RNA sequence: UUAACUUUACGUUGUAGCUCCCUUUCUCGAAAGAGAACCGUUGCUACAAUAAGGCCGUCUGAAAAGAUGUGCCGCAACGCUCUGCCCCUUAAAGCUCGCUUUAAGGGGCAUCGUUUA
C-alpha cells in the first residue's frame, strides 16, 4: 500500500522508529509515522550486574543450606540406626534434647576420655555441620580472597603439623582463645578456617581413641557412614558434561570444541594473527612478506611473549612504519603483546621449574601430547581425574610436575580435529575462511514477520533485549502498514559495550565538555576583541593552527594568528575529498590558507602534490605532515595514495560492528522486504548520521525528552542511496568552486548560486520533523504542545502552509510506548532480618557493627539511656572522626567499670529501627521490610477509589489481600473491601492510567503507589524534564479523583483506549 | 562473552549456658560502698532457620503410619506450542429501546511454555 523505508534508532533502553515514503527512484518524500519505545535495559542499573545474578546467587545459597540440612538430618538418622541414638533425647521435630555447648572443649577432651553418648553425638554433629574446606589443578591459586582463605587454611595445617597440637579442636581452644578470645571466624576473616583433610584426620583419630576407651558405638557402619557424610559432595562438571554444556564443533559434530590452552589452538590463533597483520607506512598499507612471516613465526615459542616492539625490531621496520589495529596513542603501545603461547610456556616453565626440561631447548613434547595435556587439564577439576586421563599417555614425573603448577581454563569454537586439517593451510598464508572453504567447502527462508532474536548468536543480555524490542517495533510497523521496502538502522555506539566501558565513555564525555570550554576561554584571550562567543569551527581552526606550527599545510606560508577568523583567510579542507570517500573524520581535516584551496578542487593530496612522480612538492608536503603534531592515523590518512575508492566509502557509509552485521544478515534473510534487491538492510555509520542530522537542521537537545530517540530514526530513513548521490554530487560541485552563475550540467540545469545549501530530503524538512517529533516549532521549547491530532494538524498547516504533504491521514502526536511489566513474582521481602520483639510499638532491633555505625544510627541505640557512658564515649570518638566510623572504631572499643578501667570489647551494638509493616521470616522469629508491590487492585464505592496493595509474598502464600490503603492509619485499621465495593482494574508497574481530578487531568504510566498515603506516582510518557520531578508526577491523590482508569497502549504508541476488567484476577492459578 | 556450575566461611534472626556494662528496685553499711530480682543487653560458644512457599522418589505399610535419599523447585531472560487475561477485525442472527448470542481470524501480556533441574 505504501513504499516506505523503516528507520530504527536502537539504544540499550529505547528504540526510535520512523517511516519515510519513497518514490520510485528512492528519494524520500513523505514522513508517514514515527514513534519511540522505551524499556528497562537488561542489567542491574546502578552496578551493571547481570539481571540473573541475584537469582543465581540466591539459588546456590538455597542449595547449600538445603544440602547441609539434609546431611545433618542423615547424621541424626544414622546416629538413630546405630547405637547411641537416645530415642528419648529426641523431640517432636527430631533434634537432640539438651545437646551441649561445648563441642570444641569436648573434641579437645575426646583424645583423653570416653565421652558421653550426648557429648559423642554433639561432636559428631559438630564435625559434620562444619566440615572445613576441600581442594576442589590439585592444590592451587588464582583470586585474592580465595587466596586469603587458603592462606589461613595452609597456615593452620602447617600449625597443626609443626606445633604442639593433636587435632584442629585443641589448636582452636588453646591458641585461639589464648591470643584472640574466640574460635570461629569473624567478619570477613579466614584466619581460623580448617581444611577438610585435617578434620577427616581428626574424625579418624577420635574414632581410634574412642575405641581405646570404650564407646560402644564405634561401628563399621557408624564410622563409614559418618565419614561418607563428612567427605561426600556432588561432582563438579567433568569432561563430557562440560563438552555438552558447550557447543559441538560445527565442522566436526562427532568431536567437541578444542581447549584453548592446547598446541593446536594456540597455533591457530597465532596463525590467524600473523596472516591478519598489516603495516602502515606513510599512507601505504601492505601485508607481511613471506620472509617477514618466517622470521616471526617461531618467535612466540622462543620468547615468552612476542611484543609489537620486538616485531618491529625483527622486521627491518623503518621508524615511520606502524602496526595496523594497534592503538598507538601513548608511550608503550608497542609494549603490547602480539602473541603469547600461554600453554606452551606454562608447560615449559612447569617442567623447567622442576628439572624435566633443559631450558636451552624448546620443549620436546609432541604437539599431540601438548594437546592432550591441555584438553585434560581444562576438562577436569581434581587431581584424580586428571591423573586418570593423562597417566596413560605421558610420564609420571612430568605429569606430577604439571599437577602442581598448571591451571588452564577456556575453550574455543572449533575442534582439534577440524583445526588439525585447517592450520597446516594457514601456515601457508591462507586466511581462515579460505582455509575452511577448501576443506568444508559448503559450511534462510523468509516470512512476513521477523522471527525471535536467536540468543545463541547474541551472547549479550542488553543487546538481546534491545533487539527483541526492535523486532517488536518492526513487526508492529508491518502489521499496521505492511512490508517495508528497506530497513535502515542506526544503533548507539554503547550498544554491545561493557558497563565499565559505557561509564568510562561518560566520564570522557564530561572531560571533553570541560576541555572544550577551556579551549574557548583560550580562544577568547587570544582574540580578545572578538565578537561573540566562538563556533566550533573556529576552535578547531585554532587547534589545527597549533598542531601545524602556525604553518599552512599546502603552501608553507605562515598563517597569521591575528587574521585567523578573517573571512576566507583560512579554510579547513578535507584532505581526501568527501565526495569520493564520504570520510568526515578529523583524520581528514587540515587547516590551510584560502589562497591555496581554490586550486585544489576534488584532488587528494597524493594526486594534487604529484605523489606518483616523486615531485619535490610531494616530498616537501609529505615531510610537512610527518612533522606536524598529528596522530599516526591522521598522517597515514592524509597520504593514502592507493586506497579502495569504493570500499573505503562503503566502510565509511556503513557500520560493521557485530550487532549491525547480525541485524543486516538476519533481518534480510528472514523477513520480507519489498525492496529492490541487494542490501535491503542498511546500518548507517554514526559519523555520517551525525553529519546528516547537523546539515538537515535537526541536531537535538541532549536528553531533556525521551522523544529525541525518534530524530535519528528519521535521519537514517532518509539516508537512501539516491539522496546519497544527490549529496555526493553537491559536495563535488562545492569542491571545485562552481557556485557563481554556472549551470548544473547534469539534469537540474540550475543556477549554481553563491548559496546553494546542502541537499535536503525536502524543503522545510527540519521544521516538519520537529513538529512531528516534539509537537512544537523548533527553537521554541517554551511553547505548548499540540497534543491532539487536531492541534498538530492545524500547526503543521499553519507553519508549513507551503507543504501540504506534511498533513495526511497518519499524522498523530507522538506518544512514547513503555514496555509493560506485569510479572507477578520477584523478591518477596528485603534481605536484612530484624527482631520482632517490640513490634507492637512500631520498632525493630538490629545488631549494627561499630564500623558501620554513624551518629544518626547511634541515636537509636537501644541502651542509649541505660549505659550513658557508652553512648557518650561512642559519640565523642565518632565526633572526633566526623562520622567516618571505619576510622572511628578501627582501634578496639571497650566498655569500662565504675573505677574507669577497660573491660569487655564491643564490636556491634543493638539499634532500634522503625517497623510498621514487614514479612514474617525465619520461622516467625524475624521481621523483614516489605518488597515492591507487584500489583494494586482498585475498587470504587461512593465515587471514591480504594487501592489494595498486593506484594509478592502474598502471591506466594496465595492470599488475595482484604484491605485497601488508608492514609495515616496503619494496616490493621485499613478499609476492608467486601461485596459493597466495585472492583475496576489491577495496576501493574508501568500500566497506562488516566486520573481526572478537580484541578487537572493527568495521563501517564503508573510508577509507584505510596502506602502511607495511598497516592500514586506516574511517569509522563516522554519523561519531559519540565513536568513533575524529572518527568514524574508525585503524590497524585486518587481517593477523591473524579475519574481514575486504566488504558491499553501499543508497541508503536497507537491504539490508546480504556480497558475494562470483568473479574478481579487471582494471585495463584 | 553469555548463562549454568562443587564447597567452605561469614552475616542476620530466635533460643540456651557462661560473661561486660547498667536503668528501676530490695538487703547489708556510719560511710566508702558492696550483695541479690525482673528486664535491657556486651562478648564467647552451640543448635535452629536462612526468601515468603511448594514438592519428589524408594522401601515396609491392608491402609490410614513409618523408615528414607550425593533428594528437587522457588527473586531471571526469552517466547507463544498448551492454557488464562486483555484487545482488535470480519460475518450472521436477534432482547429491546446499546446489548446479547454465534462463527472465523488477528495481536498483545502472563499466574502459561522453554531454558530447567
PDB file of C-alpha atoms in Angstrom, chain A residues 547-770:
ATOM      1  CA  UNK A 547      49.057  21.416  15.545  1.00  0.00           C
ATOM      2  CA  UNK A 548      50.671  22.552  12.273  1.00  0.00           C
ATOM      3  CA  UNK A 549      53.128  25.024  13.913  1.00  0.00           C
ATOM      4  CA  UNK A 550      51.241  28.039  12.545  1.00  0.00           C
ATOM      5  CA  UNK A 551      52.168  26.913   9.037  1.00  0.00           C
ATOM      6  CA  UNK A 552      49.813  26.205   6.137  1.00  0.00           C
ATOM      7  CA  UNK A 553      49.908  22.522   5.185  1.00  0.00           C
ATOM      8  CA  UNK A 554      49.534  23.296   1.463  1.00  0.00           C
ATOM      9  CA  UNK A 555      51.878  26.263   0.902  1.00  0.00           C
ATOM     10  CA  UNK A 556      54.247  26.642   3.863  1.00  0.00           C
ATOM     11  CA  UNK A 557      53.417  30.329   4.279  1.00  0.00           C
ATOM     12  CA  UNK A 558      52.764  31.162   7.917  1.00  0.00           C
ATOM     13  CA  UNK A 559      49.131  31.542   8.856  1.00  0.00           C
ATOM     14  CA  UNK A 560      48.822  34.868  10.666  1.00  0.00           C
ATOM     15  CA  UNK A 561      47.098  34.317  14.014  1.00  0.00           C
ATOM     16  CA  UNK A 562      45.599  37.804  14.240  1.00  0.00           C
ATOM     17  CA  UNK A 563      43.701  37.249  10.981  1.00  0.00           C
ATOM     18  CA  UNK A 564      42.616  33.734  11.982  1.00  0.00           C
ATOM     19  CA  UNK A 565      38.861  34.393  11.797  1.00  0.00           C
ATOM     20  CA  UNK A 566      39.068  36.888   8.951  1.00  0.00           C
ATOM     21  CA  UNK A 567      36.545  35.694   6.389  1.00  0.00           C
ATOM     22  CA  UNK A 568      38.065  33.418   3.755  1.00  0.00           C
ATOM     23  CA  UNK A 569      41.552  33.874   5.220  1.00  0.00           C
ATOM     24  CA  UNK A 570      41.840  30.250   6.398  1.00  0.00           C
ATOM     25  CA  UNK A 571      39.854  27.211   5.279  1.00  0.00           C
ATOM     26  CA  UNK A 572      39.560  23.703   6.699  1.00  0.00           C
ATOM     27  CA  UNK A 573      39.915  21.307   3.782  1.00  0.00           C
ATOM     28  CA  UNK A 574      39.073  17.620   3.585  1.00  0.00           C
ATOM     29  CA  UNK A 575      42.447  16.101   2.659  1.00  0.00           C
ATOM     30  CA  UNK A 576      40.652  13.309   0.907  1.00  0.00           C
ATOM     31  CA  UNK A 577      37.614  14.705  -0.948  1.00  0.00           C
ATOM     32  CA  UNK A 578      34.367  13.950   0.880  1.00  0.00           C
ATOM     33  CA  UNK A 579      32.686  13.230  -2.472  1.00  0.00           C
ATOM     34  CA  UNK A 580      34.786  10.129  -3.192  1.00  0.00           C
ATOM     35  CA  UNK A 581      35.388   8.859   0.355  1.00  0.00           C
ATOM     36  CA  UNK A 582      32.463  10.143   2.442  1.00  0.00           C
ATOM     37  CA  UNK A 583      35.060  10.457   5.211  1.00  0.00           C
ATOM     38  CA  UNK A 584      34.408  13.403   7.550  1.00  0.00           C
ATOM     39  CA  UNK A 585      36.673  12.185  10.379  1.00  0.00           C
ATOM     40  CA  UNK A 586      39.193  14.559  11.943  1.00  0.00           C
ATOM     41  CA  UNK A 587      41.867  12.268  10.455  1.00  0.00           C
ATOM     42  CA  UNK A 588      40.993  14.068   7.191  1.00  0.00           C
ATOM     43  CA  UNK A 589      40.626  17.758   8.162  1.00  0.00           C
ATOM     44  CA  UNK A 590      43.593  20.090   7.596  1.00  0.00           C
ATOM     45  CA  UNK A 591      43.932  23.856   8.026  1.00  0.00           C
ATOM     46  CA  UNK A 592      45.152  25.870   5.037  1.00  0.00           C
ATOM     47  CA  UNK A 593      45.190  29.400   3.694  1.00  0.00           C
ATOM     48  CA  UNK A 594      42.308  30.462   1.489  1.00  0.00           C
ATOM     49  CA  UNK A 595      44.703  31.183  -1.380  1.00  0.00           C
ATOM     50  CA  UNK A 596      45.632  27.513  -1.903  1.00  0.00           C
ATOM     51  CA  UNK A 597      42.326  25.664  -1.538  1.00  0.00           C
ATOM     52  CA  UNK A 598      40.911  27.413  -4.625  1.00  0.00           C
ATOM     53  CA  UNK A 599      43.258  25.414  -6.889  1.00  0.00           C
ATOM     54  CA  UNK A 600      42.833  22.038  -5.193  1.00  0.00           C
ATOM     55  CA  UNK A 601      39.355  21.113  -6.433  1.00  0.00           C
ATOM     56  CA  UNK A 602      38.423  17.500  -5.670  1.00  0.00           C
ATOM     57  CA  UNK A 603      42.028  16.270  -5.534  1.00  0.00           C
ATOM     58  CA  UNK A 604      43.634  14.127  -2.875  1.00  0.00           C
ATOM     59  CA  UNK A 605      46.990  15.445  -1.613  1.00  0.00           C
ATOM     60  CA  UNK A 606      48.639  12.478  -3.344  1.00  0.00           C
ATOM     61  CA  UNK A 607      47.323  13.464  -6.775  1.00  0.00           C
ATOM     62  CA  UNK A 608      47.394  17.234  -6.223  1.00  0.00           C
ATOM     63  CA  UNK A 609      51.003  17.198  -4.991  1.00  0.00           C
ATOM     64  CA  UNK A 610      52.030  14.583  -7.608  1.00  0.00           C
ATOM     65  CA  UNK A 611      52.985  11.708  -5.335  1.00  0.00           C
ATOM     66  CA  UNK A 612      53.282   9.410  -8.352  1.00  0.00           C
ATOM     67  CA  UNK A 613      56.157  11.463  -9.804  1.00  0.00           C
ATOM     68  CA  UNK A 614      58.219  11.761  -6.576  1.00  0.00           C
ATOM     69  CA  UNK A 615      57.995  15.529  -7.058  1.00  0.00           C
ATOM     70  CA  UNK A 616      59.829  17.943  -4.763  1.00  0.00           C
ATOM     71  CA  UNK A 617      56.460  19.443  -3.828  1.00  0.00           C
ATOM     72  CA  UNK A 618      55.265  15.936  -2.903  1.00  0.00           C
ATOM     73  CA  UNK A 619      58.253  15.090  -0.698  1.00  0.00           C
ATOM     74  CA  UNK A 620      58.050  18.559   0.859  1.00  0.00           C
ATOM     75  CA  UNK A 621      54.376  18.093   1.749  1.00  0.00           C
ATOM     76  CA  UNK A 622      54.893  14.515   2.970  1.00  0.00           C
ATOM     77  CA  UNK A 623      57.626  15.775   5.292  1.00  0.00           C
ATOM     78  CA  UNK A 624      55.368  18.683   6.284  1.00  0.00           C
ATOM     79  CA  UNK A 625      52.682  16.310   7.557  1.00  0.00           C
ATOM     80  CA  UNK A 626      55.125  13.897   9.239  1.00  0.00           C
ATOM     81  CA  UNK A 627      56.467  16.876  11.230  1.00  0.00           C
ATOM     82  CA  UNK A 628      53.060  18.065  12.485  1.00  0.00           C
ATOM     83  CA  UNK A 629      51.510  17.347  15.789  1.00  0.00           C
ATOM     84  CA  UNK A 630      49.336  14.826  14.202  1.00  0.00           C
ATOM     85  CA  UNK A 631      48.476  11.308  15.200  1.00  0.00           C
ATOM     86  CA  UNK A 632      49.843   8.492  13.092  1.00  0.00           C
ATOM     87  CA  UNK A 633      46.344   7.695  11.950  1.00  0.00           C
ATOM     88  CA  UNK A 634      45.850  11.242  10.642  1.00  0.00           C
ATOM     89  CA  UNK A 635      49.270  11.422   8.968  1.00  0.00           C
ATOM     90  CA  UNK A 636      48.558   7.999   7.463  1.00  0.00           C
ATOM     91  CA  UNK A 637      45.170   9.046   6.082  1.00  0.00           C
ATOM     92  CA  UNK A 638      46.332  12.387   4.636  1.00  0.00           C
ATOM     93  CA  UNK A 639      48.653  10.493   2.216  1.00  0.00           C
ATOM     94  CA  UNK A 640      46.645   7.363   1.370  1.00  0.00           C
ATOM     95  CA  UNK A 641      47.711   7.047  -2.338  1.00  0.00           C
ATOM     96  CA  UNK A 642      46.259   3.626  -3.095  1.00  0.00           C
ATOM     97  CA  UNK A 643      43.075   3.030  -1.129  1.00  0.00           C
ATOM     98  CA  UNK A 644      39.915   1.315  -2.358  1.00  0.00           C
ATOM     99  CA  UNK A 645      37.916   4.347  -3.512  1.00  0.00           C
ATOM    100  CA  UNK A 646      34.652   2.397  -3.328  1.00  0.00           C
ATOM    101  CA  UNK A 647      35.437   0.078  -0.412  1.00  0.00           C
ATOM    102  CA  UNK A 648      36.709   2.942   1.742  1.00  0.00           C
ATOM    103  CA  UNK A 649      33.487   4.909   1.283  1.00  0.00           C
ATOM    104  CA  UNK A 650      31.435   1.739   1.766  1.00  0.00           C
ATOM    105  CA  UNK A 651      33.056   1.256   5.173  1.00  0.00           C
ATOM    106  CA  UNK A 652      32.661   4.971   5.928  1.00  0.00           C
ATOM    107  CA  UNK A 653      28.962   4.867   4.987  1.00  0.00           C
ATOM    108  CA  UNK A 654      28.127   1.611   6.795  1.00  0.00           C
ATOM    109  CA  UNK A 655      28.528   0.343  10.356  1.00  0.00           C
ATOM    110  CA  UNK A 656      30.215  -3.053  10.581  1.00  0.00           C
ATOM    111  CA  UNK A 657      30.014  -3.925  14.281  1.00  0.00           C
ATOM    112  CA  UNK A 658      28.769  -7.402  15.148  1.00  0.00           C
ATOM    113  CA  UNK A 659      25.328  -6.146  16.197  1.00  0.00           C
ATOM    114  CA  UNK A 660      24.874  -4.432  12.832  1.00  0.00           C
ATOM    115  CA  UNK A 661      26.299  -7.303  10.776  1.00  0.00           C
ATOM    116  CA  UNK A 662      23.983  -9.729  12.571  1.00  0.00           C
ATOM    117  CA  UNK A 663      20.993  -7.445  12.016  1.00  0.00           C
ATOM    118  CA  UNK A 664      21.767  -6.788   8.343  1.00  0.00           C
ATOM    119  CA  UNK A 665      22.061 -10.533   7.746  1.00  0.00           C
ATOM    120  CA  UNK A 666      19.246 -11.838   9.964  1.00  0.00           C
ATOM    121  CA  UNK A 667      16.586  -9.274   9.030  1.00  0.00           C
ATOM    122  CA  UNK A 668      17.442  -9.512   5.326  1.00  0.00           C
ATOM    123  CA  UNK A 669      17.330 -13.267   5.297  1.00  0.00           C
ATOM    124  CA  UNK A 670      14.423 -13.893   7.487  1.00  0.00           C
ATOM    125  CA  UNK A 671      11.913 -11.130   6.786  1.00  0.00           C
ATOM    126  CA  UNK A 672      10.282  -9.883   3.695  1.00  0.00           C
ATOM    127  CA  UNK A 673      11.224  -6.641   2.410  1.00  0.00           C
ATOM    128  CA  UNK A 674       9.705  -5.459  -0.866  1.00  0.00           C
ATOM    129  CA  UNK A 675      12.955  -3.787  -1.590  1.00  0.00           C
ATOM    130  CA  UNK A 676      14.941  -3.734  -4.605  1.00  0.00           C
ATOM    131  CA  UNK A 677      17.453  -6.451  -4.128  1.00  0.00           C
ATOM    132  CA  UNK A 678      20.824  -6.149  -2.603  1.00  0.00           C
ATOM    133  CA  UNK A 679      21.325  -4.577   0.704  1.00  0.00           C
ATOM    134  CA  UNK A 680      17.837  -4.328   1.893  1.00  0.00           C
ATOM    135  CA  UNK A 681      19.083  -3.659   5.414  1.00  0.00           C
ATOM    136  CA  UNK A 682      21.423  -0.689   5.896  1.00  0.00           C
ATOM    137  CA  UNK A 683      23.295   0.057   9.129  1.00  0.00           C
ATOM    138  CA  UNK A 684      24.193   3.742   8.912  1.00  0.00           C
ATOM    139  CA  UNK A 685      27.588   4.878  10.138  1.00  0.00           C
ATOM    140  CA  UNK A 686      27.235   7.026  13.242  1.00  0.00           C
ATOM    141  CA  UNK A 687      29.614   9.670  11.897  1.00  0.00           C
ATOM    142  CA  UNK A 688      27.537  10.291   8.775  1.00  0.00           C
ATOM    143  CA  UNK A 689      24.305  10.028  10.781  1.00  0.00           C
ATOM    144  CA  UNK A 690      25.610  12.899  12.924  1.00  0.00           C
ATOM    145  CA  UNK A 691      26.715  14.819   9.820  1.00  0.00           C
ATOM    146  CA  UNK A 692      23.375  14.417   8.027  1.00  0.00           C
ATOM    147  CA  UNK A 693      21.474  15.360  11.185  1.00  0.00           C
ATOM    148  CA  UNK A 694      23.532  18.529  11.518  1.00  0.00           C
ATOM    149  CA  UNK A 695      23.190  19.541   7.873  1.00  0.00           C
ATOM    150  CA  UNK A 696      19.467  18.729   7.708  1.00  0.00           C
ATOM    151  CA  UNK A 697      18.923  21.116  10.628  1.00  0.00           C
ATOM    152  CA  UNK A 698      17.870  18.621  13.298  1.00  0.00           C
ATOM    153  CA  UNK A 699      20.685  18.470  15.907  1.00  0.00           C
ATOM    154  CA  UNK A 700      18.898  17.527  19.128  1.00  0.00           C
ATOM    155  CA  UNK A 701      18.894  18.981  22.637  1.00  0.00           C
ATOM    156  CA  UNK A 702      20.579  16.269  24.685  1.00  0.00           C
ATOM    157  CA  UNK A 703      18.136  14.123  26.625  1.00  0.00           C
ATOM    158  CA  UNK A 704      15.594  16.529  28.062  1.00  0.00           C
ATOM    159  CA  UNK A 705      12.866  14.405  26.441  1.00  0.00           C
ATOM    160  CA  UNK A 706      12.537  10.715  25.588  1.00  0.00           C
ATOM    161  CA  UNK A 707      11.386  11.668  22.071  1.00  0.00           C
ATOM    162  CA  UNK A 708      14.814  12.690  20.739  1.00  0.00           C
ATOM    163  CA  UNK A 709      15.342   8.976  20.040  1.00  0.00           C
ATOM    164  CA  UNK A 710      12.925   9.325  17.121  1.00  0.00           C
ATOM    165  CA  UNK A 711      15.007  12.042  15.448  1.00  0.00           C
ATOM    166  CA  UNK A 712      17.930   9.949  14.211  1.00  0.00           C
ATOM    167  CA  UNK A 713      15.472   7.238  13.136  1.00  0.00           C
ATOM    168  CA  UNK A 714      14.111   9.791  10.661  1.00  0.00           C
ATOM    169  CA  UNK A 715      17.632  10.714   9.520  1.00  0.00           C
ATOM    170  CA  UNK A 716      18.758   7.138   8.838  1.00  0.00           C
ATOM    171  CA  UNK A 717      15.477   6.566   6.983  1.00  0.00           C
ATOM    172  CA  UNK A 718      16.152   9.408   4.532  1.00  0.00           C
ATOM    173  CA  UNK A 719      19.740   8.170   4.001  1.00  0.00           C
ATOM    174  CA  UNK A 720      18.856   6.367   0.784  1.00  0.00           C
ATOM    175  CA  UNK A 721      21.417   5.951  -1.981  1.00  0.00           C
ATOM    176  CA  UNK A 722      19.506   8.363  -4.229  1.00  0.00           C
ATOM    177  CA  UNK A 723      19.806  11.013  -1.512  1.00  0.00           C
ATOM    178  CA  UNK A 724      23.424   9.904  -1.108  1.00  0.00           C
ATOM    179  CA  UNK A 725      24.013  10.524  -4.824  1.00  0.00           C
ATOM    180  CA  UNK A 726      22.471  13.995  -4.600  1.00  0.00           C
ATOM    181  CA  UNK A 727      24.727  14.835  -1.641  1.00  0.00           C
ATOM    182  CA  UNK A 728      27.821  13.369  -3.331  1.00  0.00           C
ATOM    183  CA  UNK A 729      27.447  15.443  -6.477  1.00  0.00           C
ATOM    184  CA  UNK A 730      26.654  18.507  -4.368  1.00  0.00           C
ATOM    185  CA  UNK A 731      29.881  18.158  -2.380  1.00  0.00           C
ATOM    186  CA  UNK A 732      31.814  17.603  -5.605  1.00  0.00           C
ATOM    187  CA  UNK A 733      30.398  20.789  -7.144  1.00  0.00           C
ATOM    188  CA  UNK A 734      31.476  22.535  -3.940  1.00  0.00           C
ATOM    189  CA  UNK A 735      34.989  21.113  -4.112  1.00  0.00           C
ATOM    190  CA  UNK A 736      35.839  22.840  -7.410  1.00  0.00           C
ATOM    191  CA  UNK A 737      34.035  26.060  -6.824  1.00  0.00           C
ATOM    192  CA  UNK A 738      31.228  26.091  -9.348  1.00  0.00           C
ATOM    193  CA  UNK A 739      28.899  28.330  -7.472  1.00  0.00           C
ATOM    194  CA  UNK A 740      28.563  31.584  -9.341  1.00  0.00           C
ATOM    195  CA  UNK A 741      26.278  31.847 -12.360  1.00  0.00           C
ATOM    196  CA  UNK A 742      27.098  28.492 -13.915  1.00  0.00           C
ATOM    197  CA  UNK A 743      24.841  25.634 -14.983  1.00  0.00           C
ATOM    198  CA  UNK A 744      24.298  22.357 -13.197  1.00  0.00           C
ATOM    199  CA  UNK A 745      25.441  20.396 -16.249  1.00  0.00           C
ATOM    200  CA  UNK A 746      23.559  17.254 -15.190  1.00  0.00           C
ATOM    201  CA  UNK A 747      19.771  17.304 -15.189  1.00  0.00           C
ATOM    202  CA  UNK A 748      18.979  20.254 -12.945  1.00  0.00           C
ATOM    203  CA  UNK A 749      20.224  22.965 -15.310  1.00  0.00           C
ATOM    204  CA  UNK A 750      20.079  25.268 -12.323  1.00  0.00           C
ATOM    205  CA  UNK A 751      21.806  28.394 -11.090  1.00  0.00           C
ATOM    206  CA  UNK A 752      24.894  27.415  -9.129  1.00  0.00           C
ATOM    207  CA  UNK A 753      24.019  30.269  -6.808  1.00  0.00           C
ATOM    208  CA  UNK A 754      26.508  31.532  -4.243  1.00  0.00           C
ATOM    209  CA  UNK A 755      24.210  29.999  -1.617  1.00  0.00           C
ATOM    210  CA  UNK A 756      23.203  26.542  -2.780  1.00  0.00           C
ATOM    211  CA  UNK A 757      22.876  24.843   0.578  1.00  0.00           C
ATOM    212  CA  UNK A 758      23.190  21.150   1.249  1.00  0.00           C
ATOM    213  CA  UNK A 759      20.620  18.967  -0.409  1.00  0.00           C
ATOM    214  CA  UNK A 760      17.817  18.228   1.957  1.00  0.00           C
ATOM    215  CA  UNK A 761      15.354  15.427   1.988  1.00  0.00           C
ATOM    216  CA  UNK A 762      12.669  18.009   1.187  1.00  0.00           C
ATOM    217  CA  UNK A 763      12.182  21.714   1.774  1.00  0.00           C
ATOM    218  CA  UNK A 764      11.255  22.557   5.382  1.00  0.00           C
ATOM    219  CA  UNK A 765      12.430  19.085   6.428  1.00  0.00           C
ATOM    220  CA  UNK A 766      13.645  20.248   9.744  1.00  0.00           C
ATOM    221  CA  UNK A 767      10.566  22.070  10.780  1.00  0.00           C
ATOM    222  CA  UNK A 768       8.240  19.330   9.862  1.00  0.00           C
ATOM    223  CA  UNK A 769      10.294  16.847  11.701  1.00  0.00           C
ATOM    224  CA  UNK A 770      10.491  18.945  14.752  1.00  0.00           C
TER     225      UNK A 770
END
